[PDB]
Design a protein around this ligand. Structure first.
Ligand SMILES: *[C@@H]1O[C@H](CO)[C@@H](O[C@@H]2O[C@H](CO)[C@@H](O[C@@H]3O[C@H](CO[C@H]4O[C@H](CO)[C@@H](O)[C@H](O)[C@@H]4O)[C@@H](O)[C@H](O[C@H]4O[C@H](CO)[C@@H](O)[C@H](O)[C@@H]4O)[C@@H]3O)[C@H](O)[C@H]2NC(C)=O)[C@H](O)[C@H]1NC(C)=O
Ligand SMILES: *[C@@H]1O[C@H](CO)[C@@H](O[C@@H]2O[C@H](CO)[C@@H](O[C@@H]3O[C@H](CO[C@H]4O[C@H](CO)[C@@H](O)[C@H](O)[C@@H]4O)[C@@H](O)[C@H](O[C@H]4O[C@H](CO)[C@@H](O)[C@H](O)[C@@H]4O)[C@@H]3O)[C@H](O)[C@H]2NC(C)=O)[C@H](O)[C@H]1NC(C)=O
Ligand SMILES: *[C@@H]1O[C@H](CO)[C@@H](O[C@@H]2O[C@H](CO)[C@@H](O[C@@H]3O[C@H](CO)[C@@H](O)[C@H](O)[C@@H]3O)[C@H](O)[C@H]2NC(C)=O)[C@H](O)[C@H]1NC(C)=O
Ligand SMILES: *[C@@H]1O[C@H](CO)[C@@H](O[C@@H]2O[C@H](CO)[C@@H](O[C@@H]3O[C@H](CO)[C@@H](O)[C@H](O)[C@@H]3O)[C@H](O)[C@H]2NC(C)=O)[C@H](O)[C@H]1NC(C)=O
Ligand SMILES: *[C@@H]1O[C@H](CO)[C@@H](O[C@@H]2O[C@H](CO)[C@@H](O[C@@H]3O[C@H](CO)[C@@H](O)[C@H](O)[C@@H]3O)[C@H](O)[C@H]2NC(C)=O)[C@H](O)[C@H]1NC(C)=O
Ligand SMILES: *[C@@H]1O[C@H](CO)[C@@H](O[C@@H]2O[C@H](CO)[C@@H](O[C@@H]3O[C@H](CO)[C@@H](O)[C@H](O)[C@@H]3O)[C@H](O)[C@H]2NC(C)=O)[C@H](O)[C@H]1NC(C)=O
Ligand SMILES: *[C@@H]1O[C@H](CO)[C@@H](O[C@@H]2O[C@H](CO)[C@@H](O[C@@H]3O[C@H](CO)[C@@H](O)[C@H](O)[C@@H]3O)[C@H](O)[C@H]2NC(C)=O)[C@H](O)[C@H]1NC(C)=O
Ligand SMILES: *[C@@H]1O[C@H](CO)[C@@H](O[C@@H]2O[C@H](CO)[C@@H](O[C@@H]3O[C@H](CO)[C@@H](O)[C@H](O)[C@@H]3O)[C@H](O)[C@H]2NC(C)=O)[C@H](O)[C@H]1NC(C)=O
Ligand SMILES: *[C@@H]1O[C@H](CO)[C@@H](O[C@@H]2O[C@H](CO)[C@@H](O)[C@H](O)[C@H]2NC(C)=O)[C@H](O)[C@H]1NC(C)=O
Ligand SMILES: *[C@@H]1O[C@H](CO)[C@@H](O[C@@H]2O[C@H](CO)[C@@H](O)[C@H](O)[C@H]2NC(C)=O)[C@H](O)[C@H]1NC(C)=O
Ligand SMILES: *[C@@H]1O[C@H](CO)[C@@H](O[C@@H]2O[C@H](CO)[C@@H](O)[C@H](O)[C@H]2NC(C)=O)[C@H](O)[C@H]1NC(C)=O
Ligand SMILES: *[C@@H]1O[C@H](CO)[C@@H](O[C@@H]2O[C@H](CO)[C@@H](O)[C@H](O)[C@H]2NC(C)=O)[C@H](O)[C@H]1NC(C)=O
Ligand SMILES: *[C@@H]1O[C@H](CO)[C@@H](O)[C@H](O)[C@H]1NC(C)=O
Ligand SMILES: *[C@@H]1O[C@H](CO)[C@@H](O)[C@H](O)[C@H]1NC(C)=O
Ligand SMILES: [Ca+2]
Ligand SMILES: [Ca+2]
Ligand SMILES: [Cl-]
Ligand SMILES: [Cl-]
Ligand SMILES: [Zn+2]
Ligand SMILES: [Zn+2]
Ligand SMILES: [Zn+2]
Ligand SMILES: [Zn+2]
Lengths: 696, 696
């Protein structure tokens, strides 16, 4: 029998382990030779695994690298101009890698060059509300100051944007042990915590879905016409650099000026967490100096694209994609995901060698330059946009398979909720205490839905990964799954060794998943989703689940507006049209579901009409005009939060029109824009509903 | 037998005649009660003809009307402020209609209000090159002058835009007998020429595809949020009014200042055609005063939408659409087309009552407010955009069936060239001297292709009709056909009685088509196209015809650039990428054609893959970012000319980047934009080609 069970049983923990080891012995930084060689290896292996074609798709995109002979660092300087304290030039390498070459030192990718000198202001997490607190309540002016911010809570790019708009002349990012040192656990190599010399790499762009900064809208191919740097998308205007907490303690310990406004501003170091500006009396003439000499340069990147042609609907694509480029060894991010994809390809290929093909075509992708802004996935999607929007059934992401070892994490479109519930009921739980029980059962017990008893938590898709182009630009139903930590104790800043040199094969094998059972469970979830999407006769999407969430989101956004009852009266702000559209969607979706159950099962045209209606439903939520000042965020229901790229926001156009509205100087204009966004949302919901009506 | 022959034989000249009479006894101005009543009549009749459903789709859009108690007119005023000459308040009504109520007086729809006074400058046709001649060569400054321009050569909206940008404070449009009085033919009612009291109505918007000025992007439904007038799309800033040639002679006869630069500036009136500014010595203190009091107001409009559900592919739409609203009686425009649609619906309905259905769904549309900016078609398409872009096979327009009686006129996508050649070879010629010969033969003889011996002329689609949203915004294969005058003697300003009160049933019956044979031929062409598109197993599109034209257009645009060889050297401007893409398109299209011929004809999925590849080919030429500053013109190959909405331009983005480039102050920037447009075009052509490659 060639069925899902055969596919799933072929997957092996031991193969995932072997592949992870293979992928994490040297760094695979985007645009370097080592990552091209890995691309070529994966191409070769996918061909031997049995795929029909496997090609490299390359692009020439803007990347960023430190200058090897002019290192980045930060100083405290006295009034004479002597540098009395310098931050580290590199992370101490882990045991047995102290001779590995080409470890990129910590830096903030895409920082401009500069050597700004000034007084330090401490800005907590550099969130929108942190800056509101400084400027509006505490009356502290960041203009011309160097800000120091702790990592965590939001994407680092949003921190940098927020500091720029506050008038900062540079940003220092650091990892506080409050956020990256779990109590009771040892620092690497003796446990999974961040040492004081550890530093988190990461880009600080604000691309809003654009892809390569120089070529928004179009692939960065050989004849592409590039923007000049001054017109590039998303580059920061001020220098930025990340440090560890040993170094941060030295910059923070002398801070003076105002006390922290409350305890939510204090991390775990032995310093006051004074906001500044500047240092206490005895050190008041000392300053902080940054030295940033990184360079942006157009560099070639390589995606691997594998095809397993469908037997019946070869013009329908189900995509499994995840990235290959890493900051250093990529022990978790991304190779724990890449090894899972590799084993999925192997298992599908085993069935293929026995004569099986999926119903629909499956595309497998090893993306490049994800770490530098989702560049590889976005350029490929830009190149192939027409194929994807008319043929794209679904995209399943495959970055890190683990961020913890407690339970499952799923973020996806509502169209996949039913598919995920049904699949996880057929999979075995890997969890201690749930031997012989389903993954659905363990997941639901450990991560209960906040709404519905007996159901598990499934989150909105946010961003900060390679699904963004597919979901928020093109409107292709998308999802992701991985193992995670306890939601109850989750402080939402990720695992301690994120984007550090310490993220190694040994981290995973010793401390996260020694038996590779959580990896195997994630391979079964990702692979099983792909299998069902590519082989089910009727696409496994339930439109009724979108109806339920649309009502929840309408209730939410209405509740936000209702904090302003006087203005809603004055400006005649009604949500009636949106609730009407959501009611109609609910009714039409119910009727479509009945037909889908009842239609003549012998009629392949009626089936395809209904499969096309299902495929184009996510597509219907796209507005070709995009969201305000974010033309590549086109989905009307979901966009990455304007304050935090990692978080999904629902009804984003109305949300942003309402945000901080009490502060706008022209309320008539501001509430007019709220009404405009309500109209756009109600229209889009009704238009999406109508795609599920009888076609003629 | 229920085949195309049965459909075609059922069409009757005498029915078209009866319907034309029925539709032209009273005015049907958009937004008036009479046009709502006609909508309701056509709805009722299409239901009785046998359509499956027939509904009204209404919208509330910005329209424009004169003030009934404060008429528009133009004066010559002396230095005392006495009005010594006034233009007419209405056209003399034709025989037997002198008691018809509700004839809208001549006006320019969407003119603002005002009473500007000043000196007259005569600007020929108010084309871009006419203003270049005045400003650059003759050194005449239009700033603060009232300009007087003859109708013809270009859409009147482009004249108004050009006059505004020259600094005019008002525009007077008139019909010169050079352009609207055919030598040897009598004035109406004794022949088909424009009398001296006749005046051409028409809107003067510059909408660039937006639809209703207040709701760009979204349908003007009950909850729509409207722009304020100041932010509306496309409204003119200066007052405008049209007059006839009796009145124009009185304004032109006193003109002084500079002589006309050459004879291409002189029309046929007995005046010098002096450019001005102002009048000759004795009258130099006299001035011209406009009085415009029209009002813009949001008004309800009504489309009739009829459905004939497909038997096999009900989710594939073939649309036959034309408008119903008229300026006055609409004897030619639009009712000569509407009567043809009515008879087509009747004939399809006859087959349907006998048990036949087309393979694909046919939609029939009676659009409203076409005369005010393609408003009805565009709002409906905005509402139904998701359905149209995933299901829209083709759109066939059906405005005026005649603009002459000499031969056929076809403007369409290359995807329909083969369909049109094959259909016209099966139709009988109605022409004198071609009795017993095919329409293909008569058409080819009278209107030879300028490229290919033995083939007929087929033009690019321009704009100024209801196909614009479908073709240039949504990328649905579109076409139009009508009878026309001799191309050899055609001065390209249309028929003399265009948009005048004299365009009546009697005009058509006495002077254009007394036997309704040209109407019948046009019904056979439009109807036959719809039949084939809705019933052919394989869609009747030949991708190879696009390959041929893309090469022609690439050669053309290259030739334009090559007028600037030094700049192409300095800025390294290469067309190689575009020629490469066109070469690839040609190769891939040839291979697709082979497969289309060879694929297993028993396999409906392979057929639909290839029908979807054919349907989505026009769609592939759409750029979701649109053309520069024209977001609703998204087709990369074809847009309405920036200088003349009626004319199609090929590779419009590159064309506009090259236009007048020698005058730009920063050549580096200007040639950079040329290169950018070349990249966009080459990319789009290659991406469209790739949609025809094997799918996996
Ligand atoms: C959720 O789905 C429902 C349908 O199940 C939609 O209901 C429509 O709601 C609109 C209001 O937004 C109704 O609009 C009204 O239409 C009247 C004419 O309707 C008849 O004729 C049309 C042809 O034009 C037919 O299509 C229709 O079936 C009816 O036979 C107008 O006369 C109304 O305007 C008058 O009242 C309004 C309000 O006071 C005034 O502003 C006007 O000046 C005017 O006097 C109005 O336009 C429409 O009929 C409803 N369709 C139905 C029941 O089929 C909801 O719109 C939908 N929700 C969303 C968000 O789309
Ligand atoms: C019309 O259709 C043809 C194909 O029939 C397209 O041809 C491609 O043209 C591009 C040039 O625009 C070629 O690009 C070159 O690719 C080389 C690598 O190609 C190999 O490996 C890739 C995987 O990455 C495979 O997909 C491919 O099949 C080959 O095996 C690069 O090494 C080249 O870059 C080098 O040279 C250039 C030029 O001097 C330098 O600028 C670089 O710095 C570098 O040294 C280059 O990128 C591509 O291989 C061709 N594909 C083929 C033949 O299949 C045309 O592009 C297409 N026209 C348009 C407009 O799309
Ligand atoms: C990760 O796994 C891959 C795949 O197994 C390893 O690459 C493979 O390495 C072997 C040994 O170097 C290569 O075989 C050799 O080929 C040459 C001749 O071409 C010959 O001199 C040797 O005797 C041997 O046959 C093999 O080609 C290569 N395969 C691919 C697809 O790249 C890789 O070494 C592993 N990496 C790590 C860090 O473990
Ligand atoms: C932090 O790092 C900086 C930069 O490396 C250190 O400052 C640098 O110190 C060196 C060595 O003392 C200086 O070079 C010397 O300059 C003198 C005077 O011109 C000259 O006599 C020597 O031959 C040599 O060239 C260098 O100028 C100085 N650079 C800067 C930018 O200040 C600093 O010592 C480090 N601080 C700590 C605490 O480690
Ligand atoms: C997830 O699993 C559930 C439970 O199996 C699936 O729902 C079930 O889907 C089947 C169709 O295979 C429904 O069966 C139908 O029953 C009706 C009679 O009520 C009959 O008209 C049809 O001929 C057919 O036998 C079944 O009712 C339904 N059960 C529910 C909703 O509780 C669900 O479709 C799966 N989701 C996927 C595949 O995305
Ligand atoms: C254009 O053609 C249409 C359709 O033939 C004409 O409308 C039709 O006019 C007749 C006569 O007025 C209507 O029938 C009448 O109905 C009422 C009762 O409802 C009754 O009092 C009369 O004895 C007679 O039966 C008919 O309903 C109407 N049909 C439609 C669909 O509107 C129209 O008059 C023609 N217009 C011109 C200018 O010739
Ligand atoms: C062109 O049309 C205009 C506007 O209708 C004509 O000018 C108007 O002439 C009337 C009748 O003479 C004027 O009304 C009268 O005004 C006088 C003085 O205040 C008063 O004694 C009368 O009882 C009556 O109200 C009117 O003011 C004047 N309007 C304007 C705007 O100038 C003009 O005569 C026409 N020219 C030709 C050649 O037909
Ligand atoms: C317009 O009419 C022409 C002439 O009939 C159509 O072209 C012809 O299309 C038929 C397919 O029905 C081609 O027949 C094929 O012949 C080849 C052998 O060369 C064979 O492999 C196939 O099984 C099939 O019999 C025929 O060659 C072709 N003639 C040409 C191009 O000269 C054309 O398709 C029509 N255009 C439409 C419908 O848009
Ligand atoms: C990286 O930093 C080095 C070292 O400071 C730069 O190389 C120097 O460049 C200057 C002029 O640009 C030369 O005069 C020096 O002799 C070079 N020094 C050495 C040691 O080679 C280099 O420009 C920087 N790389 C960049 C910007 O990519
Ligand atoms: C924060 O500090 C800056 C600079 O010290 C203030 O900006 C100055 O004030 C006005 C603009 O509002 C101009 O006259 C100056 O040119 C600005 N200076 C500079 C250096 O840009 C800013 O207004 C302060 N914000 C406060 C007090 O809220
Ligand atoms: C159309 O023109 C008429 C007549 O000049 C306007 O009606 C007058 O409006 C003013 C104030 O707006 C009144 O004081 C007059 O008594 C009205 N006159 C008459 C004869 O009714 C009317 O405003 C205009 N219509 C528009 C702008 O739609
Ligand atoms: C055409 O005429 C106008 C006005 O008579 C000129 O515009 C004036 O010149 C400059 C702007 O370039 C300003 O100082 C004045 O305020 C303008 N006047 C007005 C009324 O706008 C215009 O430059 C002339 N163009 C020529 C001679 O080419
Ligand atoms: C892995 O699971 C064990 C419990 O089996 C737990 O003690 C350990 O801390 C977990 N590792 C991580 C990194 O959370
Ligand atoms: C109609 O055709 C006749 C020739 O049969 C011609 O004399 C007449 O002018 C034509 N009418 C128009 C309006 O062109
Ligand atoms: Ca790009
Ligand atoms: Ca609109
Ligand atoms: Cl992921
Ligand atoms: Cl037409
Ligand atoms: Zn990653
Ligand atoms: Zn990462
Ligand atoms: Zn018309
Ligand atoms: Zn017209």
């Amino acid at each position: 029998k060639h069925n899902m069970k055969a596919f799933l049983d072929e997957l092996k923990a031991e193969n995932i382990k072997k592949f992870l080891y293979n992928f994490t012995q040297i760094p695979h930084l985007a645009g370097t030779e080592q990552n091209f060689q890995l691309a070529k290896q994966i191409q070769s292996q996918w061909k031997e695994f049995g795929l029909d074609s496997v090609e490299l798709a390359h692009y020439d995109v803007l990347l960023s690298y430190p200058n090897k002979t002019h290192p980045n660092y930060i100083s405290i300087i006295n009034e004479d101009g002597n540098e009395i304290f310098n931050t580290s030039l590199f992370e101490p390498p882990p045991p047995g890698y102290e001779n590995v070459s080409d470890i990129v030192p910590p830096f903030s990718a895409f920082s401009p060059q500069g050597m700004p000198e000034g007084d330090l202001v401490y800005v907590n997490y550099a969130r929108t509300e942190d800056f509101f607190k400084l400027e509006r309540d505490m009356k502290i002016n960041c203009s011309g100051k160097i800000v120091i911010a702790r990592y965590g809570k939001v994407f680092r790019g949003n921190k940098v944007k927020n500091a720029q708009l506050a008038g900062a002349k540079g940003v220092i990012l650091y990892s506080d042990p409050a956020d990256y040192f779990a109590p009771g656990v040892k620092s690497y190599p003796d446990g999974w915590n961040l040492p004081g010399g550890g530093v988190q790499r990461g880009n600080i762009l604000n691309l809003n879905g654009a892809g390569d900064p120089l070529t928004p809208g179009y692939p960065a191919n050989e004849y592409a016409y590039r923007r000049g740097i001054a017109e590039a998308v998303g580059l920061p205007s001020i220098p930025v650099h990340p440090i560890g907490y040993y170094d941060a303690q030295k910059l923070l310990e002398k801070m003076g000026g105002s006390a922290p406004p409350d305890s939510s501003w204090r991390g775990s170091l032995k310093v006051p967490y004074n906001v500044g500006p500047g240092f206490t009396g005895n050190f008041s003439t000392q300053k902080v100096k940054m030295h940033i000499h990184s360079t942006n340069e157009v560099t070639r990147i390589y995606n691997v694209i594998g095809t397993l042609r469908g037997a019946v609907e070869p013009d329908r694509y189900v995509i499994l994609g995840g990235h290959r480029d890493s900051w250093v060894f990529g022990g978790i991010d991304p190779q724990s995901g890449a090894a899972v994809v590799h084993e999925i390809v192997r298992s599908f290929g085993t069935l293929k060698k026995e004569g099986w093909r999926p119903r629909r075509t499956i595309l497998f992708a090893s993306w490049d330059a994800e770490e530098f802004g989702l560049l590889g996935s976005t350029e490929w999607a830009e190149e192939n946009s027409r194929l994807l929007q008319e043929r794209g059934v679904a995209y399943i992401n495959a970055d890190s398979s683990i961020e913890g070892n407690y339970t499952l994490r799923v973020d996806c479109t509502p169209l996949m909720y039913s598919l995920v519930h049904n699949l996880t009921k057929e999979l075995k739980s890997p969890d201690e205490g749930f031997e012989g029980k389903s993954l659905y059962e363990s997941w639901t017990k450990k991560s209960p839905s906040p709404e519905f008893s007996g159901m598990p938590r499934i989150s909105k898709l946010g961003s900060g990964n390679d699904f963004e182009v597919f979901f928020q630009r093109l409107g292709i139903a998308s999802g992701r799954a991985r193992y995670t930590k306890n939601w109850e104790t989750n402080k939402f800043s990720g695992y301690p060794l994120y984007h550090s040199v310490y993220e190694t094969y040994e981290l995973v094998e010793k401390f996260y998943d020694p038996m590779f059972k959580y990896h195997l469970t994630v391979a079964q979830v990702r692979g099983g989703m792909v299998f069902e999407l590519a082989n089910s006769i009727v696409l496994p999407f339930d439109c009724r689940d979108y109806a339920v969430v649309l009502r929840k989101y309408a209730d939410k956004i209405y509740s936000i507006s209702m904090k302003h009852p006087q203005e809603m009266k004055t400006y005649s702000v009604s949500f009636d049209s949106l609730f009407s559209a959501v009611k109609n969607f609910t009714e039409i979706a119910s009727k479509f579901s009945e037909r889908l159950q009842d239609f003549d099962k012998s009629n392949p045209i009626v089936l395809r009409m209904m499969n096309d209606q299902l495929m184009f439903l996510e597509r219907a939520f796209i507005d070709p005009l995009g969201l305000p000042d974010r033309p590549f965020y086109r989905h009307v229901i979901y966009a990455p939060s304007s304050h935090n790229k990692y978080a999904g926001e629902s009804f984003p156009g109305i949300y942003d029109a309402l945000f901080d509205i009490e502060s706008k100087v022209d309320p008539s204009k501001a509430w007019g824009e709220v009404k405009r966004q309500i109209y756009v949302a109600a229209f889009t919901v009704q238009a999406a509903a109508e795609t599920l009506s009888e076609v003629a």
